[PDB]
Amino acid sequence: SKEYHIDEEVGFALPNPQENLPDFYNDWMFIAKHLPDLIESGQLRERVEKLNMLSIDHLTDHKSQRLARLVLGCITMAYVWGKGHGDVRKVLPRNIAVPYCQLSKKLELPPILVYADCVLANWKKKDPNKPLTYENMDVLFSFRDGDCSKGFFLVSLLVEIAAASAIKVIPTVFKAMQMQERDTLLKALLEIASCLEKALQVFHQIHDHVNPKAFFSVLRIYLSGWKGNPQLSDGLVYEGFWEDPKEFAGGSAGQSSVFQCFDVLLGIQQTAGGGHAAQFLQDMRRYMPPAHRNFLCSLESNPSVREFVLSKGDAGLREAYDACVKALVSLRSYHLQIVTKYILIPASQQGGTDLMNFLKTVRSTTEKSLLKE
Amino acid sequence: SKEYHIDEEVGFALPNPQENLPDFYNDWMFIAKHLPDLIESGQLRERVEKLNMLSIDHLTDHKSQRLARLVLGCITMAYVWGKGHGDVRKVLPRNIAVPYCQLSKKLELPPILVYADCVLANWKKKDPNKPLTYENMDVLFSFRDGDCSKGFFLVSLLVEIAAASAIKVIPTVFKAMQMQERDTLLKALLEIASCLEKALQVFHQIHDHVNPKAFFSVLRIYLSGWKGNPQLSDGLVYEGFWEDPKEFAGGSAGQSSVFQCFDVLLGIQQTAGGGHAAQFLQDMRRYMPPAHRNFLCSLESNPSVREFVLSKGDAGLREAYDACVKALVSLRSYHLQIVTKYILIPASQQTDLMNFLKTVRSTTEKSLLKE
Ligand code: HEM
Ligand code: HEM
Ligand SMILES: Oc1ccc(Cl)cc1-c1cn[nH]n1
Ligand SMILES: Oc1ccc(Cl)cc1-c1cn[nH]n1
Ligand SMILES: Oc1ccc(Cl)cc1-c1cn[nH]n1
């Protein structure tokens, strides 16, 4: 590939993000490094106003700028939702709203916490000379004590690094098609399916590191946005930056590029149709880094691997392509059982069928693309 | 400029489209070649219904499939809207709804008549040796006798080809910004500014071939879709392909790819934000051919030309960039004049859209180098 900011070892996630802003921004990071104690003791929402407007011009590196996107990303999320019980804040102060919105429009991201922030730029190696395992990694910023966000964010990242190992052979696939090298194409497609089968194994780790009570009842509120959300009926007001309140969608893993990249590579029409699911995934691309957004657009400009394999009438090539489509149906059927345990069941203990049909539609169209036609 | 299916003469349009399908589709072609006659005689719907279901497996090349799309697209709009007097059909019969939908998914386009059907693939040179001018061209299919569909389509197409001549220099803009070649970058922008300038002069031909009442009362209804239409509140049933009635937008020049690419090129954030205008132009992109959608998002992959120009302190450079933007404000201001003549005052003869054209006009005029 060219420079869509892809790391051969890590992929779309940010490789080794820096852990601390420059000492100018010390007073920012203070609220960011201490949100658990800060909102439990009720000291959070006013310490925001105690801040004065820092300028973004001394964040020199991309790693520096994106780390600041994370600290301001969570600082706003903790401000708007607060305790997490219903006390809502419908307007951000301006000494925090316009630093965020400026660096957001410089990085071309919406001024909200996106998946690229709280996962891809939100980790560190405990001991730098170890493998990237959950035992050796740690999240840089959490919202509340017992959030399980360490397990939730990193297990999310861990299977992203797992499937990103398949990105490296995507050029091999398109090479083998155009130069009509049948065998290497079949071994490239099998290696694609290997990673997605292993990303399902890494997905198993979420049971050990997140419990359903915490996720649904503390972590889910802090990651929800103010688009189509009654608590901020028509969005959040940005003092000094925008006249009116603007609506933005909360974090989703639909903003990850690998979890849309395999759907376009395999000719799976996730974004086709005027459907709710297609519109959701198409819109979530706006919440991806501009380099990653340009990477999906770049994949869509290639010939369909699905049409190539079906034309050749090769039982070998078709079985390998189905393996990838199967490995995706697996990752989404298993996700369905996890949404069952971590959202469905904790909701019946305090309408939501729309949540399950979306994920079933995205799997339904994935299952249709199998070479059973 | 790799194969985004942009010819250097006709641009986004289809270079020399096909007008005859194979003999296996005569029953389709007959209905399409006689849409006015079949509608005036009340015979159209009976002919569409008695159709046998035909396989799309004989449409081999891209052009044959584009003709059948425009063939089946027009027959569909004819069947749904009828004589145009409110007696609609909200169930498209199986024997036409299935081949239409199979073909549409094969070409990755909504199963409704789209701009790249009735315009970019709906033309024909009278004489193969003479240039592309209105008097040398003709449409392939029309709705009613006197609907001025020849004028409306061919003028829109000729305006597109005019602006399409600017597509060829877009590679030199981004390579000049790259190598920092100032003078060639200035000549490139002014060449864009001239092609946009000429397209406005081609636009003037609209008054000579489109009668205002025939458009508003006749042609505007055979181009309307079933998305937010009270006459088909929940869409149209594609009997035999989907259980449910689907909603789809009618033809609109928002589906034209020339007239969204220049806003992207010049850093005009027409699709930015979440407003209704930005989403309508974003929602209208799913109606472009797949190779044309790819061209737009790949332009977005490039650095912003506007911020580059704003950094140079080069008055000659800015005057050239502004020349492009002002030519877009001219085209949109003259459009607003046109919509008043061809829609507004015919409606008075027994604002939601006007605020849309003024919103996008203001967004363009905001990109003028004043900040
Ligand atoms: C307890 C854990 C999880 C819960 C409760 C959960 C819940 C959900 C929900 C509710 C959605 C619906 C979209 C929305 O409403 O925003 C969703 C979408 C999605 N989730 Fe998860 N999720 C979890 C873990 C994961 C992980 C670890 C991944 C991958 C790293 C993942 C990948 C996706 C993807 C790709 C979508 C978009 C729909 C699709 O492409 O199929 N999720 N998730
Ligand atoms: C009698 C002739 C015309 C009428 C009545 C007309 C009417 C309209 C209307 C109502 C819209 C808004 C979208 C909608 O409500 O569906 C629109 C948008 C548009 N029309 Fe036209 N139009 C005409 C001719 C043309 C021609 C010849 C072009 C050739 C370029 C053109 C280009 C556009 C474009 C690009 C838009 C999208 C908004 C924008 O990009 O600024 N139209 N037109
Ligand atoms: O895994 C995640 C990590 C961070 C954020 Cl903001 C969202 C997700 C997610 C998973 N499924 N839907 N959203
Ligand atoms: O849609 C996906 C594409 C790739 C990968 Cl690795 C995972 C998913 C997924 C997982 N859970 N729901 N969707
Ligand atoms: O110019 C056109 C040609 C064909 C079709 Cl379907 C629509 C338009 C149009 C222009 N402005 N609104 N719609």
From Swiss-Prot, chain A:
SUPFAM superfamilies xref list: Indolic compounds 2,3-dioxygenase-like (SSF140959)
Q: What does the tissue specificity note say?
A: Expressed in mature dendritic cells located in lymphoid organs (including lymph nodes, spleen, tonsils, Peyers's patches, the gut lamina propria, and the thymic medulla), in some epithelial cells of the female genital tract, as well as in endothelial cells of term placenta and in lung parenchyma. Weakly or not expressed in most normal tissues, but mostly inducible in most tissues. Expressed in more than 50% of tumors, either by tumoral, stromal, or endothelial cells (expression in tumor is associated with a worse clinical outcome). Not overexpressed in tumor-draining lymph nodes.
Q: Which reaction does it catalyse?
A: D-tryptophan + O2 = N-formyl-D-kynurenine; L-tryptophan + O2 = N-formyl-L-kynurenine
What EC identifiers does the entry list? 1.13.11.52
User: EC class of this enzyme?
Assistant: oxidoreductase
Record GO terms (molecular function): electron transfer activity; heme binding; indoleamine 2,3-dioxygenase activity; metal ion binding; tryptophan 2,3-dioxygenase activity
Any known activators or inhibitors?
Activity is inhibited by and MTH-trp (methylthiohydantoin-DL-tryptophan), modestly inhibited by L-1MT (1-methyl-L-tryptophan) but not D-1MT (1-methyl-D-tryptophan).
What cofactor requirement does the entry state? heme b
Q: Does the keyword Heme apply?
A: yes
Regulation: induction:
By IFNG/IFN-gamma in most cells. Exogenous inflammatory stimuli induce the expression of IDO1 in antigen-presenting cells such as dendritic cells, macrophages and B-cells.
Among Gene3D superfamilies, the record links this protein to:
1.20.58.480
Can you say where in the cell this protein is located? Cytoplasm, Cytosol
This protein's pathway reads: Amino-acid degradation; L-tryptophan degradation via kynurenine pathway; L-kynurenine from L-tryptophan: step 1/2
Q: How is the cofactor bound?
A: Binds 1 heme group per subunit. In the active form, the heme iron is in its ferrous state Fe(+2). The catalytic cycle does not alter the oxidation state of the heme, but IDO1 is prone to autoxidation.
The Swiss-Prot or TrEMBL record describes its family as follows: Belongs to the indoleamine 2,3-dioxygenase family.
Q: What does this protein do?
A: Catalyzes the first and rate limiting step of the catabolism of the essential amino acid tryptophan along the kynurenine pathway. Involved in the peripheral immune tolerance, contributing to maintain homeostasis by preventing autoimmunity or immunopathology that would result from uncontrolled and overreacting immune responses. Tryptophan shortage inhibits T lymphocytes division and accumulation of tryptophan catabolites induces T-cell apoptosis and differentiation of regulatory T-cells. Acts as a suppressor of anti-tumor immunity.
Subunit details: Monomer.
Other remarks on record?
IDO1 is the target for therapy in a range of clinical settings, including cancer, chronic infections, autoimmune and allergic syndromes, and transplantation. IDO1 and IDO2 are 2 distinct enzymes which catalyze the same reaction. IDO2 affinity for tryptophan is much lower than that of IDO1. 50% of Caucasians harbor polymorphisms which abolish IDO2 enzymatic activity. IDO2 is expressed in human tumors in an inactive form: tryptophan degradation is entirely provided by IDO1 in these cells. IDO2 may play a role as a negative regulator of IDO1 by competing for heme-binding with IDO1. Low efficiency IDO2 enzymes have been conserved throughout vertebrate evolution, whereas higher efficiency IDO1 enzymes are dispensable in many lower vertebrate lineages.
List the protein's name.
Indoleamine 2,3-dioxygenase 1
- Per the UniProt record, the source organism is Homo sapiens (Human)
Underlying gene: IDO1
